[PDB]
Structures are given as C-alpha cells and as structure tokens.
Amino acid sequence: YLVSAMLLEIPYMAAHESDARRRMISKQFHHQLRVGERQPLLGPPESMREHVVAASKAMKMGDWKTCHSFIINEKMNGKVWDLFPEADKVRTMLVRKIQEESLRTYLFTYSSVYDSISMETLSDMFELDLPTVHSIISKMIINEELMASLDQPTQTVVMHRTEPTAQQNLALQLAEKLGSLVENNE
Amino acid sequence: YDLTTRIAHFLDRHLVFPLLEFLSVKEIYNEKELLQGKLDLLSDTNMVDFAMDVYKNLYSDDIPHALREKRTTVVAQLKQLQAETEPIVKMFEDPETTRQMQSTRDGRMLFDYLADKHGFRQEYLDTLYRYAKFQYECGNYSGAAEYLYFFRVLVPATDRNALSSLWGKLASEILMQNWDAAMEDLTRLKETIDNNSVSSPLQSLQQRTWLIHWSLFVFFNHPKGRDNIIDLFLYQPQYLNAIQTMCPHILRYLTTAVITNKDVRKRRQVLKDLVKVIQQESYTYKDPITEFVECLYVNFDFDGAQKKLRECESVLVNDFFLVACLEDFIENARLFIFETFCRIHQCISINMLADKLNMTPEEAERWIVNLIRNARLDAKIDSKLGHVVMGNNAVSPYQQVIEKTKSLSFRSQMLAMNI
Amino acid sequence: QWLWDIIDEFIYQFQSFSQYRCKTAKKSEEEIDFLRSNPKIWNVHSVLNVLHSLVDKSNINRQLEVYTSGGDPESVAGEYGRHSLYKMLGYFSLVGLLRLHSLLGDYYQAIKVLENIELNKKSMYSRVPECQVTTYYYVGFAYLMMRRYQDAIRVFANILLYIQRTKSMFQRTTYKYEMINKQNEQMHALLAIALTMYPMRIDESIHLQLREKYGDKMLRMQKGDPQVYEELFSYSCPKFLSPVVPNYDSVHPNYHKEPFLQQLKVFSDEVQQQAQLSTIRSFLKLYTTMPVAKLAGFLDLTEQEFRIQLLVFKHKMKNLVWTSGISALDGEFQSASEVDFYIDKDMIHIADTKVARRYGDFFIRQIHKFEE
C-alpha cells in the first residue's frame, strides 16, 4: 500500500514500463470486479476502500478508515504497542500524502503553495519539505524549484504532447523489435 | 557477503604486536580518539603518530607512547622519563642484552658482503637465517631491512619471518618517516596479503586493515593511490565484514580521489554501491562531521545541507593526520553540493545566495561563468541581475527513434538484394 | 619481386588503353554503335571505366614514390592518360563523365584546384547517383580547400547519409568502400569542429553514438587540448593525396621517404590554423553587449596578460566569423549570438520513409513477379 499507491503513479500517466504484477492487485483485480460495493468489513476491502481514496489524495479519507474497528480486528492492538504502531503508520501516511501532489495533482499548476500545504496536512513543515526535495532528485518532475521564496513554478505542458507519444509507447515496441527481427531471422 | 558464514565465529579474533593501550581519556575530538585507537591497536606501536595525537590536547600522560617499544628507538623512551620528571628509571636491560650480540653483529654485518659481492647463494643461506632471526630481534635497523628485502628476499620459514619482519620493515621505515620505503612496502603489503596465508578470517581482518593502514597517513599522489585502496579484496567501502570497523577514513579517500582529480557524475562508485547497505551506515551513525556528507546527501537539502557541511568542514579541517588533502576536499565538498543544486534547480540571485554560500556576489558571478566553461552548468548568464537562467528540458524528442527505425533495418534490406 | 613487373603490366596497359580510348572517342561513332550492338550488357565497360581509373590513380603514385624528382609517371599519366581523354567528344553515357572523374582523382590528389568551374562545366550530362556520390566526394574537398566550411559541410552530410539509393554490386566502387566511408567520417568530423555551434548538420550523417564521440573528440580539440587536432590529422595525413595506399614500407631507401614527408609538410599547414580558429572561437556566447568591465572579466579566461589582452582579442575578433564592437564614451562591447533550432529536420526525411517502403517493396516485388 506504501510501495504501490506511490511507486507506480509516475509511469501510470499512460507511461507503462515498470510493471510489478504481485501486489494488492491479487485483491484489487477481484474486489472491484463486482458491482454492489458499500462500507467495508474484511481486512482486504477495509484496506482497499481508503487505498482508492488515498489515490485521489483525500488525506483524511485515506487515514480514518484504517483506525475504526481494525484496533480490535488485530491491526492496531495485537502488536504489543498501543498508539506507537499507528504513530509510525499515520506519520508514514502524512508523508506519502504530500508525495501525492508530486505525481497526481501537478497538471495545470503554474504557481504552487508550500506554507499552507504542510499546515493543511498538519505535519512538521520540514518533514514534508524533504520528500518534495527527494521527488526533484529522484522523480525529476517537469517543475522548477526556487525555495528562497518558498514557491515553485512548474510549466508542466505535456498535456496532449504525451498522447502522440502514447502512440510512441507502441512505436517503441515497433522500434524495440526491428532491433530484434534480424536477431530472430539471422 | 560470503565471509560472514564463518567470521560469525570470529568477529575480530586477531592478535597483533600492539595489544591493549592507546593514550587514554581526552576532552574533545572524541571520535578521532577511537578511530585513532583501533587502527593503533591493529597497525603498529607508533612512534610520532601518538605525538600527532599529543599535539592537539594538553593532559599529562605522554608515557606509554614509544616507551613500550624497548629493543629499538631507545632515545625517545630514555628521555621520556625525566621529560616531565617520571621515576620510571626501570629502562636497564636493552643496553646489556643487545650489547651481548656485538660479536655475532660484527661477524654477520661483514657476512653481508660475504653473500652480496661474492655473489653467493649458500653463504647467503648461512647469513640469511642469522639475519632472519636478527630482523625479528630488533628492527630499526631499517638500514639492515632496506639491505635485506631489496636483494634476494626469501627466508627459511617463508611464512613466519617473511610475514613479521616485512611487517617490521614497513614499521621501522614509517617510524623514521620514509616514503620511498613505504611505497615499496605498500606493494610488499599487497604481496603478503594476496600470498595469502593459512588466511582464516582472523588474519584476513589483519590483511584488509593492513591495506587501510598505509593510506590512513596518505603521503603520495593518493588521488592515484586511492584507486589502489579501491580495487582489492571484495572491494567494499571497508573491505572487511567486521561491521564495527574503526579504520573508517577509506570513504574520505574514496570521496577525495573521486571529487578532487576524478569527477562525481560519474559518482556511481562512491554513492550507489559504496553507501546505503550496512557499514557506511554504521560509520554514518558513528561520525559527527562526515555523517552529513552522506546523511544530508540522502536528505538532498538545498541550502540547509551546504550550510551544515560548511560547519562540518570547520572540523573536517581540524583533521591533522598525514592529511595530504584538507583544503582540497573542503572546496570539493562545496563544489559537490552546488552541483546537486544546479543539476535540479531553476535560477536564483547571487547576492542572497552569497549569504547562503559564505562569499560575495563578484566571486559568485565569475565562478558561475567558470561553471559554464566547466561544462557542469549548461546555461546562459545576464549582465548584473545575478539570475543565472538554466532552461534544461527536451524539445519533443522523436528524431532519436526516427533514426532507430530506419538507419538499421533499411541498411539490412539492401544486404540481401545482391542475389 | 611480386611488386615491380606488376607495376609495369598495369601502367603499360593503362597508357595503351588511354591510346585506343582517346583516339576512338573524338570523331567517329563506329566502335560506339558496335559496343552498343554486340555487348548489350552495359556493365563490363562501365567496370573497365572505373576499376582502371582507381588502380591508375594508385599505381602512378606508387611509381612517383620512387621517381620523386624529374619523375615521368605523373606527367605522362596526368597530361596524356587523363587530359587527352578529358578533351573528348562527350559520349552518350557515363564515359565522358567518368573521364573528368578519372582526372579529378589526380586533380584533387595534386592540389592545383580552381578550375572547379571547368570540372562541373564540361559535363552537361546526367550525373548518375553512383557518379554524383563520387562528385560530392570530389567537390566537397574543393570547398573545404577554399576556406568555406559553413557551405562545404553541405556536400558531405548527404554522402555519409548515402541517401540516394546506392547499390552496385558489379565490383564498381570498388574494392575500397568502407575506407571511402572512413574518409567520409574524417570529412564530416573536419566540418563539425570549427563550425559547432553553427550546425545543425551533424544530425543526419553522424548519429548519436559516433556523434557524441566526435563531440567529445572535437570539443577537447576546441578546449585547447590538441590530442584531437593530433589524432584527426595523424589519421587524415595521406587521405587528401594518397595513392589508394602506398605499396611496401622497407628500411633503406630515401626515394620512398620524400612523398610522405611531402604529404606531411604542405597539408599540416592547413590543419595547424584549423585547430587555432577552433580554439579562438570555442568559448560560448554568454552576454550580448558587455560593459568594458564584463569585456575584461570574460577576457580573464579568453585572453589576458595584460596588455596586450584587448588588441590580441582584436586579432581574435577580425575573422569574418566574430561579429564584435567597441563604442568609446558609451563604453559598450557589442557581440553577436548566431543560434539554430532542431525540430525542422522532418520535411524530406518523411518523403524518405515513403521511398524506404517503396524500396522494401522493390526487391520482394520482382521476386514475386519472377516466382509467379
């Protein structure tokens, strides 16, 4: 949930070539593969039902479905630490819920806010500054860092430049295998 | 890697010449003391490397430095007592015991040329065993050692004497501050370690730390000589499993060689497969100054890191070993963290950055154009604004694949119309 | 032995074929219409045409290697074996075109080139792609000679592209093709160094792997580390007036030693100032109209000490390729910045993917018709 709902959101802009096919998808395939879906009861739904609303960041919709009746369902209490496993967990949520603006909500963002972004997610400002810092050196977002002002203009305009290269995603498979047909033949 | 299967038995069960003590409790430079201490326990009984440690501080006890090496280097220890009025007159066996040799001494000091200039290999064999025992007895006697291991080398017990007396050759020549002797011994330590031995993980730890010892006190062009201490023995950051290896300047040299003479583009050696796993992380939690060279690099901070590393370089410059690289790595660390800035960042004012950088605007502006000629900053400047505009993004890169589709398979098509 | 009687055999039947090919190519049309009638195969005497022209250019230079001074070989070849076959009834083929190619082989070799007018004057005939690839090979040299690199690059990118559907495939190029390609690498590498940033033409011929190679290569030459000035011309020294390659290197003789010293001493003059003008311009167009402070602040790397900084920069500013200027009491150092885009390379490449499909059609479609 913390190495899937983050990792493959950077190549899931119709940019598939990092595919990990042993994950929640063992569940995610089958418990959206039905029609009548209301309040979750089991572990897998009561995990997936706020996973999908951790996807569309919703920073408290993602958290406060992991701390209702799980505590007696042997998630929170069952570990011989009461509020320290959740203090580990919900911190690990509050950090992977600024790293949602990173890959997800950056579309038509030309100006960006930073004081209020950590105040919104009620986290230590530096603790959510250092992973957005990580995202520049690791994820290399089409955005520009100027952190003496504590703002970043993005200039992210690949909006429909990315779709004729969605037609190149395959002209890659064209180009990959014409670098493989003679390997076949000769 | 694979050493841990057995060495879980050991965990440093070696035993060497300097056994227990290094000059005890200090005030400050508390880290340097323990990473001084353990290499001191496992290198050799030094002999102004303790005078190096005495200088910085002020205490009292200069007593167990060179006194606990009796047989040779007798002047240091004999003065040491009334140096600060120490009644340790108990010094009186060396003069009598080594004086007894003097008959055999005069015999075999001339039996030198009986084997040498005659060109004998059998009157060699006679003097060889006597010299062999003589080299272990008392050894500075770097004159005897430089005459021994230069000419025909091999010694009857090809393990014990060729190990101990050649480790004593490296000792004595370093104790007189010889470096040409140290660089032939550099290789004579490359020889003995890769002989190798019976070579239980026990004396493997001896061997790996043996090729850390000589470049602890870097003296040569070690910007070359660190490529020598980077390319041997399952070449780790440390070289041992021994997760608590307290000989840990191997990364200071790694980084020096790769940033000073080499570049860090081209850092794949130093950062990717030398760091995050186990033992760099161990020494990261040890260190106060060098911890942030990786800690605030794995945090990727933009100004806060370069500031903290400037405050770290204020005591990285407090390293007064045989350093050969103090101000070198200082301005190389500044270069590095500003490369980690320009590689990602947009553009920002010289005058305020010069407050972040501990410098002035005129130094910033020309140095930024010096980065233009470095080929590390690929951008353009303006007049005076101090706003060096970097506009690094691709322009619709499809002519790359245009070439890939045709220039191979089209040239492959005409290959078979010769029919 | 195994050299000299072969030299005689080749050169004797060369000047004997020059005889009956000069004489029966001027007035009459009897041999013409009989070589039309009997051999309809329009091949073996386009083979004779080119093969003997190449081994003539080589073997007369192999005789020149010995006869350096008062040497008959190049005189008897270059005048009667080349220029008498030149002044000819322009025959209805690639014969008259190959006669002026066969002599331009020597006329590029020996470097008395400025009737380049006459070389492209005399042929009013269809320069065949097979022959016009050789024309690009031939004329491109004459325009790197004329101190015009910016438009001599226009000649070599198209032949190392080899985009004009080149195949023959009757032993006709011949027997030295990938060495011709390797010389075409030398010429595109040559026209890249002192020009970049200007092209915008090391896209098409030289591709990303040996483009960044000749990038790292030419830019270390530009930086002023002359290891590439050294390497480029060290491996381009005979490539301007070579035979095809000299016969045999031995120890004793002085005659063989003169022509390789000759090819050294005269064209090492050309390359010395090529790498000079490269290193003079090398540095980037940072600021536009600099104040005299910023002028000198950039001459801190470019040229200082101290005196005569400004006036040796004048020696670097008068080149026809350095648009500068100094206004006195305004104190304004004006300088130009000549840029280029990249995305405008997809106008005839798109027609080339059309013709590349039609080529992929050709060979298989005649196979289909022959099989059917």
Concatenated DSSP letters of B86-99: -------SHHHHHH
- Check if the beta carbon of residue A153 is closer than 8 Å to that of residue A110: yes
* Partner A contacted by B19 (CB < 8 A): no
* Partner A contacted by B232 (CB < 8 A): no
Pick from B147, B171, B160, B170: nearest CA to B197: B160
Cβ-Cβ contacts under 8 Å between B and C: the total is 53
**Touching subunits for chain B (3+ Cβ pairs under 8 A):** A, C
Q: Do chains C and A touch (3 or more CB pairs under 8 A)?
A: no
Give the distance from CA B176 to its chain's centroid.
20
Cis bond leading into C359, ω under 30°? no
Q: Pinpoint the alpha helices (H) of chain C.
A: 4-23, 30-37, 44-64, 72-76, 83-86, 96-109, 116-119, 129-144, 153-161, 178-193, 208-223, 227-234, 257-281, 292-302, 309-317, 349-371
* Partner A contacted by B394 (CB < 8 A): no
For residue A144, give every residue at least 6 positions away whose Cβ sits within 8 Å of its Cβ, in sequence order, or none.
Answer: A152, A153, A154, A155, B345, B346
- Angstrom resolution of this structure: 3.5
- The partner residue sitting opposite B405, judged by closest CB among A140, A148, A174, is A174
CA distance from start to end of chain C: 55
> H or E stretch including A182?
helix A181-185
Cβ-Cβ contacts under 8 Å between A and B: the total is 55
Contacts of C208 in chain B (CB under 8 A): 400, 403
Task: Determine the residue of chain C that is closest to B382 in CA distance.
Answer: C287
Task: Note whether C207 contacts B407, CB cutoff 8 Å.
Answer: yes
Q: Do chains A and B touch (3 or more CB pairs under 8 A)?
A: yes
Whole-angstrom Cα distance, residue A75 to residue A66?
A: 9
Mutate to test the interface with C, among B366, B369, B419 (most CBs of C within 10 A): B369
User: Among positive and negative, which fits the CA dihedral B70, B73, B76, B78?
Assistant: positive
For residue B99, give every residue at least 6 positions away whose Cβ sits within 8 Å of its Cβ, in sequence order, or none.
Answer: none
- The partner residue sitting opposite B395, judged by closest CB among C291, C343, C360, is C343
- The partner residue sitting opposite B302, judged by closest CB among A133, A172, A178, is A133
Rounded alpha-carbon distances, angstroms, from residue B313 to B251, B301, B330, B360 = 15, 17, 6, 19
Structure tokens at C38: 């009997």
Pick from C62, C64, C43: nearest CA to C54: C62
CA distance from start to end of chain A: 46
The interaxial angle of helices C129-144 and C153-161, nearest 10 deg, is 150
What's the gap in Å between the CA of B344 and the closest CA on chain A?
7
Task: Note whether C352 contacts B406, CB cutoff 8 Å.
Answer: yes
* Partner A contacted by B299 (CB < 8 A): yes
Pairing of strands C290-291, C324-327: unpaired
- Check if the beta carbon of residue C196 is closer than 8 Å to that of residue C242: no
- The partner residue sitting opposite C359, judged by closest CB among B382, B407, B413, is B413
Half-sphere exposure for B289 (CA within 13 Å, toward CB): 20
Whole-angstrom Cα distance, residue A141 to residue B344?
A: 10
- The partner residue sitting opposite B401, judged by closest CB among A136, A147, A175, is A175
Query: Edge-to-edge, what's the strand order for the sheet holding C290-291?
Result: C290-291, C332-335, C324-327
* Partner A contacted by B291 (CB < 8 A): no
Pick from C326, C282, C321, C322: nearest CA to C302: C282
Q: What does the angle CA C143 – CA C146 – CA C150 come to, to the nearest 5 degrees?
A: 60
Whole-angstrom Cα distance, residue C288 to residue C338?
A: 11
C 68-107 residues with CB < 8 A to B: none
Torsion angles phi and psi, residue A65, rounded to 5: -115, 0
Whole-angstrom Cα distance, residue C54 to residue B63?
A: 89
Give, as one character, the DSSP assignment of residue C327: E
Secondary structure class of C133 (helix, strand, coil): helix
Count how many residues are written for chain B.
419
Residue A135 CB burial class (10 angstroms; 0-12, 13-18, ≥19): buried
User: Among positive and negative, which fits the CA dihedral A25, A31, A34, A37?
Assistant: negative
Whole-angstrom Cα distance, residue C317 to residue C296?
A: 14
Mutate to test the interface with C, among B413, B418, B419 (most CBs of C within 10 A): B413
Task: Determine the residue of chain C that is closest to B396 in CA distance.
Answer: C343
* Partner C contacted by B416 (CB < 8 A): yes
Whole-angstrom Cα distance, residue C271 to residue B59?
A: 70
* Partner B contacted by C283 (CB < 8 A): yes
